[PDB]
Amino acid sequence: DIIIATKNGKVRGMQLTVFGGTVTAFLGIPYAQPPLGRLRFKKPQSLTKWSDIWNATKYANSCCQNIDQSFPGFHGSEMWNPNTDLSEDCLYLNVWIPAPKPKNATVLIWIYGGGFQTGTSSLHVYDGKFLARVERVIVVSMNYRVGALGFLALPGNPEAPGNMGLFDQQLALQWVQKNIAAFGGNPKSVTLFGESAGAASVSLHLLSPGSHSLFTRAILQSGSFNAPWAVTSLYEARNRTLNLAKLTGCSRENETEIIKCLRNKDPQEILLNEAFVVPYGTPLSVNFGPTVDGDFLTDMPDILLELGQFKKTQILVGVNKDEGTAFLVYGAPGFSKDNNSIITRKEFQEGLKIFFPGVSEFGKESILFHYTDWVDDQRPENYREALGDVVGDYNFICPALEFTKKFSEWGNNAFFYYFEHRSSKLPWPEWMGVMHGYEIEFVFGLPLERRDQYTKAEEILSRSIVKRWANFAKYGNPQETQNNSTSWPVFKSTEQKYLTLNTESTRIMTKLRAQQCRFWTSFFPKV
Amino acid sequence: DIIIATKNGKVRGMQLTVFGGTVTAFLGIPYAQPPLGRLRFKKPQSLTKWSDIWNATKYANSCCQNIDQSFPGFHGSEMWNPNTDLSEDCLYLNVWIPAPKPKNATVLIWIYGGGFQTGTSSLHVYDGKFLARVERVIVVSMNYRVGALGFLALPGNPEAPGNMGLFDQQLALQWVQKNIAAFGGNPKSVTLFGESAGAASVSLHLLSPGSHSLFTRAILQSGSFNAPWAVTSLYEARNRTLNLAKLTGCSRENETEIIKCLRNKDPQEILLNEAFVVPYGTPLSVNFGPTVDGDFLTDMPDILLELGQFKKTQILVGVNKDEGTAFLVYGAPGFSKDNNSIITRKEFQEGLKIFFPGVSEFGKESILFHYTDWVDDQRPENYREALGDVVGDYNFICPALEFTKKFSEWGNNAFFYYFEHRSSKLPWPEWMGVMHGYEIEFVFGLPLERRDQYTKAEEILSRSIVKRWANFAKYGNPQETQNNSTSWPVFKSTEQKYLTLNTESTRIMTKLRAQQCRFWTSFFPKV
Ligand SMILES: *[C@@H]1O[C@H](CO[C@H]2O[C@@H](C)[C@@H](O)[C@@H](O)[C@@H]2O)[C@@H](O[C@@H]2O[C@H](CO)[C@@H](O)[C@H](O)[C@H]2NC(C)=O)[C@H](O)[C@H]1NC(C)=O
Ligand SMILES: *[C@@H]1O[C@H](CO[C@H]2O[C@@H](C)[C@@H](O)[C@@H](O)[C@@H]2O)[C@@H](O[C@@H]2O[C@H](CO)[C@@H](O)[C@H](O)[C@H]2NC(C)=O)[C@H](O)[C@H]1NC(C)=O
Ligand SMILES: *[C@@H]1O[C@H](CO[C@H]2O[C@@H](C)[C@@H](O)[C@@H](O)[C@@H]2O)[C@@H](O[C@@H]2O[C@H](CO)[C@@H](O)[C@H](O)[C@H]2NC(C)=O)[C@H](O)[C@H]1NC(C)=O
Ligand SMILES: *[C@@H]1O[C@H](CO[C@H]2O[C@@H](C)[C@@H](O)[C@@H](O)[C@@H]2O)[C@@H](O[C@@H]2O[C@H](CO)[C@@H](O)[C@H](O)[C@H]2NC(C)=O)[C@H](O)[C@H]1NC(C)=O
Ligand SMILES: *[C@@H]1O[C@H](CO[C@H]2O[C@@H](C)[C@@H](O)[C@@H](O)[C@@H]2O)[C@@H](O)[C@H](O)[C@H]1NC(C)=O
Ligand SMILES: *[C@@H]1O[C@H](CO[C@H]2O[C@@H](C)[C@@H](O)[C@@H](O)[C@@H]2O)[C@@H](O)[C@H](O)[C@H]1NC(C)=O
Ligand SMILES: *[C@@H]1O[C@H](CO)[C@@H](O)[C@H](O)[C@H]1NC(C)=O
Ligand SMILES: *[C@@H]1O[C@H](CO)[C@@H](O)[C@H](O)[C@H]1NC(C)=O
Ligand SMILES: *[C@@H]1O[C@H](CO)[C@@H](O)[C@H](O)[C@H]1NC(C)=O
Ligand SMILES: *[C@@H]1O[C@H](CO)[C@@H](O)[C@H](O)[C@H]1NC(C)=O
Ligand SMILES: *[C@H]1O[C@H](CO)[C@@H](O)[C@H](O)[C@H]1NC(C)=O
Ligand SMILES: *[C@H]1O[C@H](CO)[C@@H](O)[C@H](O)[C@H]1NC(C)=O
Ligand SMILES: *[P@@](=O)(NCCC)OCC
Ligand SMILES: *[P@@](=O)(NCCC)OCC
Ligand SMILES: [Cl-]
Ligand SMILES: [Cl-]
Ligand SMILES: [Cl-]
Ligand SMILES: [Cl-]
Ligand SMILES: [Cl-]
Ligand SMILES: [Cl-]
Ligand code: NA
């Protein structure tokens, strides 16, 4: 029976047999006052503190959010939907510790992605007990507010200042600073890690001064704040806050009145209108995201990046080989998970309309021009592959590569990887390739579980990834030093070396997507 | 009607329509006195010279040689068998010129391979009219003596000095020096090119002082003289010459007597005994090859290489991705072109006995040890792939890579490629992959012929290869400069960069076969 006392009270955990060993899980420890009522839309507040013993023996509620109902009964999509009740009262974190209680363990803190509109730390692919069993690190993850309830902004106004969910992430990192040594953790060795919006989040904590002393290093999976979906301009943010006001009949004249009104609507009604705060939208819409609030984020982050203002420490950044594929079956004419989606040229053109809504005609032709001159005009899946590349390179790959270059230029070691293994168990079709989100399970160690139908080659890839990640976290270098592994070079502006992750040989290459990111990065931002 | 006058007489050629254009072929021009009778086994002699007009309107005889009868009726193998009568009277070359007659063309001279035991310049895959049509270079190729009749040695004795066929190659390069300007050629711009034994040959002309001024630059396809099959030690050479003497009842006491005897045997009888001049032999045997004769080759070539004694000029070297596969179906138990050859561990071990005949037991285990510890023990074709790699890396890849490093260390630009396209028309089975010999057709331009059932992607690959090769030859740099092509770095000792050739994207990589050539190159030579 395992009780540990925290600044805020006592908590009891639960024992778990993992790979003939034991890990102790403390699931659902709260970490702020629930943000209800007068608290809805505001920065998270001090956890007040309990006598008695909190039982942290189940996952807690997920924050309120819309669910994906595009493919009901389909594991591919439904594995991302929340798997505990939704509730405004959702500010809880989990801790996983090795048994016996370690003495001064390195801490991995996961930030889930979800477009800032969705996600929960209790997904199966985010289970921290393999890491803690196998590398005897500690693993912490947090639920943070998503959608309007976490990122609604009316700037300057503390009733709705913006970035609420980013400060919930922040107050969780404070909670580990204050409390983790009690579970055996080293607060001086914390690595943040995250995927997609959770990676974007990690990147902004690197820019945020209030985070600067709550962690040591950073991992960025398929995401960084300079991605085009990751930050909302102050313009659009008020437009959206007021479009929301409109839609819930809350338009007012006093702005503390709009908020006061909005703080009365039921959850379902805010959720139900989020999708429409915006005229055209796309499968990659982020209607309520991070903003420059003068508080968490003191200036446009692209400026802060360029001018070297951010935490100086090492970063590990990566992307998957087919990032863009997963979003095509949510709206691009011709695309299906249930056939092979050979689309035509005219369909590709229509696709650009779905993905690049407004979006000058010359903008769109220039993408066509870049992506459709091939070698050669023969192959039927030419147009199908090109549209996935537009979307991967634009939305994820080129921005992760430019973050890493700008970041490495100021001095610190960075490592870049290029993940290209397709999971033997992937439920989406072949044509969709090495999809977005599908490294997560390798990073968390799921394939180490033999009982589970992954290949030998996959267990091996996983065991090695897990060791590189845990070496980065403790040592700032992601090598696997024992099993004659390919050495992972640092990424520099100049040679731009990266390491490829696959079940066969892993290689050192140079200048991923060189010709394509020259398009996205220098020319496109102009159209 | 196209006549051109040469130092030795006049010759008439023939016109050919190629790709809506015309090339002029002069096939079978003789280039030495036929080596018959008193000449058999001796260096080639001065072409004496004719009035009248030689018609060079057909390919001439191939030199005497054994044929491959392993797969009668099979195109895979039979495409390599000679396709004009065999005859001792076989010292002829072909010239292909663009029409209109160029003014000062660069000259490509092909040296065919064939293990030094076989081959002929009239194979279809060696047809020089695409190169001449498309790049308006001139292409010359020569028949040279192979097998005992070209490489029999009894050292010091001019009746059989060794290396006869290497001096036939040499006298052909002299013939181009003397005569090519008449066909429109620049004798100051000659590139030698060759595959397997023909590449080994090219490499030794780089070491041979008598060749040093008969050419400008060198191309090495799947071959170099430091390959383990490419040079015969003086020991084994006399053993073999006398074993041959024995076997044809010619053992004598006077050595000019053994030769005088041997010069009486019919061709078929020498050919018929070549295979047995040697106790164990292997699918890669070279019973009669180059030797250090004190004439063409003044010292062990490994010493000459190490100590920087060789023509200083640029080299382009390459290997195919599955070099070793083709030789497994000639003797390795379990292997077949007609099934997928999943062999067992015990079969692999037996395979090493076939390929590494004598061959300490510890030698052989150490190869097993290097090549059979995998990731992981699951895949059934594990042993099948490993045996092809032993044979490729040992026989071709590691020695081509070490030639290029040693050569680049003295100052000159080198380029290395790694060919990894499997021909859509390959007649051998899939498991055999990107085989030895199967770049030749891309280099010669065969896929440019649309009429011929190659893919679009293949025509494109070919057109690009042809342009890189022709740029090397004229400019010493194999770039394709027009079509936004990946830039080919020079290979240096240090980064060891190479370019991959495939129908998709071509890449810059580093240190091909690093771990394997550390085995072949430092450790193995010791066993
Ligand atoms: C800022 O918001 C306005 C508001 O428009 C909207 O009203 C909201 C409640 C919501 O329902 C939304 O879907 C609706 O469009 C946007 O104005 C609209 O723009 C489009 C094209 O520009 C027109 O066809 C609409 O008729 C127009 N609506 C109104 C009522 O004016 C405005 O576009 C937006 N800014 C951006 C850049 O997206
Ligand atoms: C692959 O499927 C797409 C997806 O749309 C369909 O899903 C199919 C399996 C189909 O049977 C039907 O149930 C559903 O609409 C097919 O494209 C569709 O084709 C029609 C013309 O019938 C369009 O007007 C539809 O809107 C269009 N769907 C989309 C997403 O735009 C696509 O044709 C199919 N192609 C194949 C088999 O190669
Ligand atoms: C140098 O040659 C000798 C000669 O042996 C051979 O006689 C030749 C005419 C030819 O027919 C050949 O196949 C035959 O073997 C080699 O000697 C032989 O070596 C093996 C094993 O070492 C024995 O089993 C043989 O009995 C023996 N033969 C004789 C007649 O002595 C010798 O091996 C060779 N050198 C090398 C290194 O290959
Ligand atoms: C793949 O074929 C090899 C090759 O040998 C055979 O070719 C076959 C297609 C076969 O039917 C027969 O005509 C010819 O011998 C097979 O290996 C052979 O197996 C036998 C046992 O029958 C050995 O004693 C043979 O010597 C052996 N051949 C060799 C080259 O050593 C091999 O078993 C086969 N495997 C398959 C189908 O996977
Ligand atoms: C636990 O270790 C403390 C500091 O360790 C870290 O140094 C940091 C700057 C960072 O590099 C981490 O990754 C290092 O591991 C030390 O000062 C504490 O006093 C220690 N307390 C213990 C051992 O219980
Ligand atoms: C033909 O060009 C002659 C030399 O050209 C070469 O220079 C060499 C050293 C080598 O680099 C080659 O690749 C160059 O192309 C020149 O001296 C002759 O006089 C020329 N004769 C003509 C134009 O008919
Ligand atoms: C907390 O859980 C323990 C463990 O069995 C139990 O003994 C205790 O009463 C629980 N308190 C609750 C559910 O409030
Ligand atoms: C080292 O490889 C062995 C097998 O040789 C295996 O036990 C394990 O997966 C490896 N350790 C790491 C960190 O990869
Ligand atoms: C050489 O060929 C020409 C071309 O038709 C012919 O006119 C001439 O007589 C030939 N001489 C031979 C075959 O000796
Ligand atoms: C250049 O590419 C074009 C098609 O754009 C084609 O005509 C030709 O194959 C190319 N030239 C070379 C040397 O590859
Ligand atoms: C608007 O009116 C209310 C009064 O209850 C107040 O909450 C808000 O701050 C006022 N601001 C102004 C000056 O318009
Ligand atoms: C061996 O005898 C013959 C004599 O006709 C000759 O050709 C050869 O050079 C002689 N060499 C010696 C000295 O044994
Ligand atoms: P990430 O959190 N960002 C995509 C922006 C919509 O993953 C979405 C599936
Ligand atoms: P290359 O001329 N060398 C192999 C040595 C026997 O090609 C043989 C097929
Ligand atoms: Cl094509
Ligand atoms: Cl590795
Ligand atoms: Cl790329
Ligand atoms: Cl395996
Ligand atoms: Cl290219
Ligand atoms: Cl390799
Ligand atoms: Na442009």
Please report how the helices B164-179 and B197-207 are oriented relative to each other, as an axis angle in degrees rounded to 10: 70
For ligand 2, atom 4: residue with the closest CA: A336
* Contact across the interface for B507 and A509, Cβ inside 8 Å: yes
Task: For chain A, say whether B254 makes contact (Cβ under 8 Å).
Answer: no
Q: Quote the CA–CA distance of A173 and A213 in Å, as a whole number.
A: 9
Task: For chain A, say whether B484 makes contact (Cβ under 8 Å).
Answer: yes
Cβ neighbours of residue A478 closer than 8 Å, sequence gap 6 or more? A316, A415, A468, A469, A471, A472, A488
Query: Which residues line ligand 13 at a C-beta cut-off of 6 Å?
Result: A 113-115, 196-197, 229, 284, 286
* Contact across the interface for B515 and A456, Cβ inside 8 Å: no
Interface test with A, best of B374, B375, B459 (most A CBs within 10 A): B375
Q: Quote the CA–CA distance of A35 and A43 in Å, as a whole number.
A: 8
Resolution as reported, in Å: 2.1
Size of interface A-B (CB pairs under 8 A): 27
Q: Tell me: is residue A392 an annotated ligand-binding position.
A: no
Residue A61 structure tokens = 């509620």
Q: Could you give phi then psi for residue A515, rounded to 5 degrees?
A: -65, -35
| Chain B residues touching residue A508 (CB < 8 angstroms) | 509-510
The B residues from 189 to 218 touching A (CB cutoff 8 Å) are none
Cβ neighbours of residue B431 closer than 8 Å, sequence gap 6 or more? B325, B340, B341, B381, B384
Query: What number of other Cβ atoms are within 10 A of residue B453's Cβ?
Result: 10
Q: Is the CB of A344 under 6 A from ligand 2?
A: no
Residue B57 structure tokens = 């309107």
The shortest C-alpha distance from B377 to chain A (Å) reads 9
Q: Quote the CA–CA distance of A330 and B239 in Å, as a whole number.
A: 76
Residue B190 structure tokens = 């000659």
Evaluated on CA atoms A52, A56, A58, A61, the torsion sign reads: positive
Closest ligand by atom to B14 CA: 9
CA of A53 to the centre of ligand 7 (A): 8
Q: Quote the CA–CA distance of B443 and A448 in Å, as a whole number.
A: 47
Interface test with A, best of B456, B494, B519 (most A CBs within 10 A): B456
Task: For chain A, say whether B338 makes contact (Cβ under 8 Å).
Answer: no
Cβ neighbours of residue B434 closer than 8 Å, sequence gap 6 or more? B320, B321, B322, B419, B420, B421, B422
Question: Residue B107: beta bridge partners?
Answer: B138, B190
The two most distant CA atoms of chain B are separated, in Å, by: 72
For ligand 6, atom 13: residue with the closest CA: B189
Q: Quote the CA–CA distance of A201 and A230 in Å, as a whole number.
A: 9
* Contact across the interface for B455 and A378, Cβ inside 8 Å: yes
Quote helix, strand, coil % in chain A, to nearest 5: 35, 15, 45
Amino acid at B486: T
Q: By what method was this entry solved?
A: X-ray
Substitution candidate for ligand 10 out of B465, B483, B486, B501 with most atoms within 8 A of CB: B483
Q: Quote the CA–CA distance of A415 and A317 in Å, as a whole number.
A: 6
Alpha helices in A180-233 (DSSP H): 197-207
> In this structure, are strands A53-55 and A9-12 parallel, antiparallel, or unpaired?
parallel
Query: What number of other Cβ atoms are within 10 A of residue A49's Cβ?
Result: 9
Q: Is the CB of B335 under 6 A from ligand 4?
A: yes
CA of B467 to the centre of ligand 10 (A): 10
Q: What atom of ligand 10 comes closest to residue B460's alpha carbon?
A: 9
DSSP run (H or E) holding A38: none
Q: What atom of ligand 5 comes closest to residue A476's alpha carbon?
A: 13
Cα→Cα distances B97→B8, B108, B137, B139, Å:
19, 11, 7, 7
* Contact across the interface for A484 and B515, Cβ inside 8 Å: yes
DSSP run (H or E) holding A29: strand A21-30
Q: Are the CB atoms for A458 and A503 separated by under 8 Å?
A: yes
Cα→Cα distances B84→B59, B60, B119, B124, B166, Å:
7, 7, 11, 11, 22
CA of B492 to the centre of ligand 19 (A): 21
Q: Are the CB atoms for B186 and B215 separated by under 8 Å?
A: no
Q: Quote the CA–CA distance of B34 and A443 in Å, as a whole number.
A: 72
Q: Could you give phi then psi for residue B181, rounded to 5 degrees?
A: -75, -25
Q: Which of B192, B225, B524, B195 is nearest to B399 (CA)?
A: B225
Q: In what order do the strands lie in the sheet with B185-195?
A: B14-18, B21-30, B92-99, B138-142, B105-111, B185-195, B217-221, B315-320, B414-419, B497-501, B508-510
Q: Is A320 helix (H, G, I), strand (E, B) or coil?
A: strand
Q: Are the CB atoms for B416 and B405 separated by under 8 Å?
A: no
CATH number for the domain formed by residue range(s) A1-527: 3.40.50.1820
Q: Are the CB atoms for B31 and B93 separated by under 8 Å?
A: yes
Q: What atom of ligand 10 comes closest to residue B480's alpha carbon?
A: 13
Residue A101 structure tokens = 């209680």
The A residues from 495 to 514 touching B (CB cutoff 8 Å) are 507-510
The B residues from 363 to 382 touching A (CB cutoff 8 Å) are 375-378
Residue B21 structure tokens = 């254009």
Q: Are the CB atoms for A499 and A417 separated by under 8 Å?
A: yes
DSSP state at residue A48: -
Substitution candidate for ligand 5 out of A104, A106, A108, A188 with most atoms within 8 A of CB: A188
Strands, E assignment, A59-104: 92-99
Q: Are the CB atoms for A137 and A106 separated by under 8 Å?
A: yes
Substitution candidate for ligand 12 out of B38, B159, B254 with most atoms within 8 A of CB: B254
Q: Quote the CA–CA distance of B517 and B394 in Å, as a whole number.
A: 8
Breaks (C-N over 2.5 A) in chain B follow: none
Strands, E assignment, A155-258: 185-195, 217-221
Query: What number of other Cβ atoms are within 10 A of residue B101's Cβ?
Result: 15
Residue burial B359-383, b: 16+ Cβ < 10 Å; e: rest = eeeeebebbbebbbeeeeeeeeebb
Task: For chain A, say whether B261 makes contact (Cβ under 8 Å).
Answer: no
For ligand 14, atom 4: residue with the closest CA: B115
Q: Are the CB atoms for A36 and A64 separated by under 8 Å?
A: no
The shortest C-alpha distance from A61 to chain B (Å) reads 42
Q: Which of B397, B434, B389 is nearest to B416 (CA)?
A: B397
> What is the CA angle A458-A463-A467, rounded to 5?
145
For ligand 12, atom 11: residue with the closest CA: B254
Q: Is B269 helix (H, G, I), strand (E, B) or coil?
A: helix
Q: Quote the CA–CA distance of A68 and A347 in Å, as a whole number.
A: 25
Quote helix, strand, coil % in chain B, to nearest 5: 35, 15, 45
The shortest C-alpha distance from B509 to chain A (Å) reads 6
CA of B210 to the centre of ligand 11 (A): 101
Q: Quote the CA–CA distance of B398 and A358 in Å, as a whole number.
A: 56
Q: Could you give phi then psi for residue B419, rounded to 5 degrees?
A: -80, 125
DSSP run (H or E) holding A497: strand A497-501
Q: Quote the CA–CA distance of A9 and A52 in Å, as a whole number.
A: 7
Per-domain residue ranges for chain B?
1-527
Side-chain-facing half-sphere of B84: CA atoms under 13 Å: 20
> In this structure, are strands B414-419 and A497-501 parallel, antiparallel, or unpaired?
unpaired
Q: Quote the CA–CA distance of A221 and A438 in Å, as a whole number.
A: 11
* Helices and strands (H, E) in chain B, number of each type: 16, 14
SS (H, E, C) B105-170: EEEEEEECCCCCCCCCCCCHHHCCHHHHHHHCCEEEEECCCCCHHHHCECCCCCCCECCHHHHHHH
Tell me the catalytic residues of A.
Answer: 196, 323, 436
Q: In what order do the strands lie in the sheet with B53-55?
A: B3-6, B9-12, B53-55
**Nearest-CB residue to A508 (from B376, B377, B510):** B510
Please report how the helices B345-355 and B361-371 are oriented relative to each other, as an axis angle in degrees rounded to 10: 130
Cβ neighbours of residue B163 closer than 8 Å, sequence gap 6 or more? B151, B153, B290, B291, B293, B295, B296, B297
Q: Are the CB atoms for A390 and A353 separated by under 8 Å?
A: no
Q: Quote the CA–CA distance of A221 and B138 in Å, as a whole number.
A: 55
* Contact across the interface for B460 and A515, Cβ inside 8 Å: no
Cα→Cα distances A435→A61, A126, A428, Å:
28, 17, 9
Q: What atom of ligand 2 comes closest to residue A329's alpha carbon?
A: 30
